[PDB]
């Protein structure tokens, strides 16, 4: 009885659901991309989208680019460590990356740099 | 230099890529490229690009993969209301037409649809047909 | 007796099947069956059932194909408004909360989204990635 | 400027789009099925759905069932004759059926009967 606010601006509006695959009642959406060299992408960025974008830019930019990530703070603690996915609908490289052990704690990436096909995250 | 960066499970809100080379390949996407990207995303097609590309503007696979990577699914479809950032936003939520705030049957209808979508999403997650999903 | 009935391009609104045998197999669908049906529909999987089935209630393929056959896509998602029959339907459209009737910026937003969806649908049709679509 | 009504009950509502495959802005929907023997299915029925339902019921009912179709009248004239679809996302049998020549004119099916794996439409 406390998921939906009963007083304020967001009064009566049900919670938002995000997913990388379709579900009953889903609505296909797209992220806004705009190039200025620099490239800007805005919207709700999920980890698979970021990994796919890095994979594409690695080949497109010949393994040389820098990225500045703006994070939503109340979701930074999700990195807290906790310890057959072929049909989940993800690239095998993304599945391999996401099946790791959480190293960061209460902290999120703020700057990613790739030089000569080597990653040096900040 | 590590091969891969550590996995981040936080939800970013804006990305800015800077590089010496040109990003103009990811602009003026043709209709065919967008349609192919949407279809590829809906049908779970894996794209393996070559090690290096010297003419990105003439590569259809790269642009189709870009359009595929720019697709996600959100349950509530209200085009005139901001929906992703729900914690600590009130300047962008001020002065909007919200009929559900006062009417109650409409709120009950929205709640029932949300419950059905949530149940379907959990059932998809259980059968390993969906990696993860966020509830905000 | 012909093998197949002639193709009908009209839009039905209700179907009633009657048979001597039991239709109880298409009831109480499990969560796994519904999830599999949705995934199969989204990934365009073809299901070929055997010539005859004697235990329909124990056939997972039949129920998954049923759930797959009960799926379609509609652009405007307004759960509290009837949307399919738009011609000659005013009794069911009376007494509803419609903020777009008076507000104008909201109407412009809805129109822009509809235009984008229409353009995307036509582009999908052109590339032979969509057989047909109706505009009502 | 006449697609959207400017006065009446449906004032400001954009036209509805229906499709058998996903598109930008689509919302996944489902038809209501309920069994009473008899089976009832309600909602916007497109030809591929009807063909798939008949294909399923042929095997399930051992080639013996009868169907009563209720039609939307303003869409009955679509049967007027007019004279590589493997990736369209349809069953090959449905593609074969839909690639025929329109026989009906201004008329729609009102009763379909299948006995001993033979179709006798009314």
UniProtKB/Swiss-Prot annotation, chains A, D:
It is found in: Nucleus. It comes from the Eukaryota. Belongs to the DONSON family. Component of the replisome complex. Replisome component that maintains genome stability by protecting stalled or damaged replication forks. After the induction of replication stress, required for the stabilization of stalled replication forks, the efficient activation of the intra-S-phase and G/2M cell-cycle checkpoints and the maintenance of genome stability. This is Protein downstream neighbor of son homolog. The gene is donson. The chain holds residues 436 to 579 of 579 of the full protein.
């Amino acid at each position: 009885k406390s998921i939906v606010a009963a007083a304020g601006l967001q009064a009566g509006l049900p919670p938002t659901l995000l997913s990388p695959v379709a579900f009953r009642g889903a609505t296909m959406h797209a992220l806004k991309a705009r190039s200025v060299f620099s490239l800007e992408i805005t919207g709700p960025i999920m980890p698979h989208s970021l990994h796919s974008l890095t994979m594409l830019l690695q080949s497109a930019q010949r393994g040389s680019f820098s990225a500045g990530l703006y994070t939503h703070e109340p979701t930074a603690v999700f990195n807290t460590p906790i310890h057959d996915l072929q049909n989940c609908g993800l690239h095998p490289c993304t599945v391999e990356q996401l099946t790791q052990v959480n190293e960061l704690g209460k902290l999120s990436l703020r700057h990613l740099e790739m030089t000569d096909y080597r990653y040096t995250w900040k | 230099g590590s091969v891969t960066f550590p996995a981040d499970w936080s939800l970013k809100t804006r990305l800015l890529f800077t590089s010496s080379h040109s990003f103009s390949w990811a602009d003026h996407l043709k209709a065919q490229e967008e349609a192919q990207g949407l279809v590829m995303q809906c049908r779970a097609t894996a794209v393996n690009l070559p090690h290096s590309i010297q003419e990105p503007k003439l590569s259809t696979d790269l642009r189709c993969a870009f359009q595929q990577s720019l697709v996600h699914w959100i349950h509530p479809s209200l085009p005139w209301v901001q929906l992703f950032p729900r914690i600590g936003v009130d300047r962008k939520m001020a002065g909007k037409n919200t009929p559900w705030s006062q009417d109650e049957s409409l709120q009950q209808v929205l709640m029932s649809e949300w419950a059905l979508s949530f149940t379907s999403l959990y059932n998809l997650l259980k059968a390993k047909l969906c990696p993860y999903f966020y509830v905000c």
